[PDB]
Structure formats: C-alpha cells, structure tokens
C-alpha cells in the first residue's frame, strides 16, 4: 500500500487480528494493541489502506492480520495519535469512534508491508516504550 492514498471505496477499514465475521457488531472497550492492560474507549478505523494494513500487522494476537470494512453507528473524529503529530492534519485518514461499528465486509486483496519495514516499525515502537515516549491517546 501507499501512505495517504484513500481507498477506492471511500469505505472505513479496520485492521485487527480478531476473528470477526460479516454481520458482527463490535463495541468499544477491548484491550489496547499498544499498551498492555489499557481498556479502550474507542474503535479505530481509517480510510487509507496503508493505515489499515498497519492496524492488521501491529494488532496484538496470534494468527494473521485481517482488514474489515466497517460501518460506524455514531460520530467519528480524527485519531489524535496521528493527527497534527508527525504531519499537519490527518493525512492517513485515521479516525476513532466512541460508539459500536458493524462489520460489513472483509478485504481480501491486500499485501503487507515488506518484512524489513514492518520490523523497523516494531523495533521503533519497542524503542519508544523503552524510552517512555509511547504516549497512547484514547
Ligand atoms: C496510521 O499510523 C501508522 C502508520 C502511519 O504512517 C506514517 C507515514 O504517518 C505517520 C504519522 C502521520 C504520524 O503522526 C506518526 C506518529 O505520530 C508516530 C509514528 C511512530 N513512529 N515510531 C514508531 C516506529 N518508528 C517509525 C519509530 C518511531 C509514526 O510512524 C507516524 C507516521 C507514519 O509512519 N508516533 C510517534 O512517533 C510517537 C511519539 C508515539 C506513538 C505512539 C502510539 C504507540 C502510536 O500512535 C500507535 C497507537 C499507532 O497510532 C501507530 C503505531 C500507527 O499505527 C496504527 C495501526 O495506527 C502508525 C503510526
């Protein structure tokens, strides 16, 4: 995938290693993928495939990444972890919602980041943790 490229569909995507199926309704309050033990207030979704693939790859869990197309029941807002942080605005088109979402499809035709790019991201995040700089906004 290409960073900042909006998916053809305009649809909201959710990358995860959870075993979801079309027709599931997902409510907030599951555990963070980035800070063990943290109970989440939001569901995180995106309109770029690149951000969804990172969500699938970086999600906690055994088993492979999945990307779902989802329909929010309620309001969505910019995800502050990636908005006005490294870049101005929200170029990854990443959002979050306090209300449930429905799983309406599964994206089957994606490929992951090349392995050294995924390893660099993983290593970078462990480093931020080791330095106490991995602040999670939620
Ligand atoms: C869609 O976002 C993805 C890719 C964007 O593509 C791309 C090109 O545009 C980015 C934007 C616009 C950012 O604002 C950004 C950012 O703020 C950030 C890191 C992190 N960089 N490092 C980690 C590895 N590394 C390169 C060295 C340091 C980034 O790489 C990016 C970044 C990119 O890479 N944040 C930090 O540095 C700091 C200080 C803290 C991070 C804290 C928590 C832990 C994270 O926020 C968690 C909650 C997730 O939100 C991220 C892991 C995102 O994963 C998902 C699934 O969302 C990932 C950024």
CA angle (57, 62, 67) in 5-degree steps: 40
Q: Give residue limits of the domains in the chain.
A: 1-138
Q: Whose CA is nearest to atom 40 of ligand 1?
A: 134
Distances (CA, A) of 23 to 7, 62, 106: 22, 23, 11
**Experimental method, per PDB record:** X-ray
**What is the DSSP code (8-state) at residue 131?**
T
| Residues facing residue 66 across a β-bridge | 16
What's domain 1-138's superfamily in CATH? Rifampin ADP-ribosyltransferase domain (3.20.170.40)
Q: Which of 17, 33, 82 to mutate to test the pocket of ligand 1 (most atoms within 8 A of CB)?
A: 82
**List of E strands, 1-138:** 12-16, 25-26, 43-46, 66-72, 76-78, 94-97, 101-107
Q: How far is the CA of 23 from the centre of ligand 1 (A)?
A: 30
Instruction: Enumerate the H helices of the chain as residue ranges.
Output: 49-58, 115-130
Q: CB within 6 Å of ligand 1 — which residues?
A: 3, 34, 51, 54-55, 58, 81-82, 85-87, 91-92, 94, 121, 124-125, 128, 133-134, 136
Q: CA dist 20 to 13, 26, 80, 116, Å?
A: 13, 9, 26, 28
- Cβ neighbours for 84, distance < 8 A, ≥ 6 positions apart: 90
């Amino acid at each position: 995938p290409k960073p900042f490229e909006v998916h053809e569909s305009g649809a909201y995507l959710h990358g995860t290693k959870a075993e979801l199926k079309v027709g599931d309704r997902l409510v907030p309050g599951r555990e963070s993928n980035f800070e063990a033990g943290r109970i989440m207030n939001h569901i995180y979704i995106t309109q770029t495939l690149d951000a969804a693939v990172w969500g699938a790859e970086l999600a906690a869990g055994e088993g492979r990444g999945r990307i779902f197309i989802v329909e929010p029941e309620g309001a969505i807002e910019d995800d502050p972890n990636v908005t006005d942080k490294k870049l101005p605005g929200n170029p990854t088109r990443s959002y979050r919602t306090r209300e449930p979402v429905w799983i309406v499809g599964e994206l089957t035709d994606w490929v992951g980041h090349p392995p050294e790019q995924l390893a660099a991201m993983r290593q970078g995040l462990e480093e931020l943790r080791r330095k106490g700089l991995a602040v999670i906004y939620d």
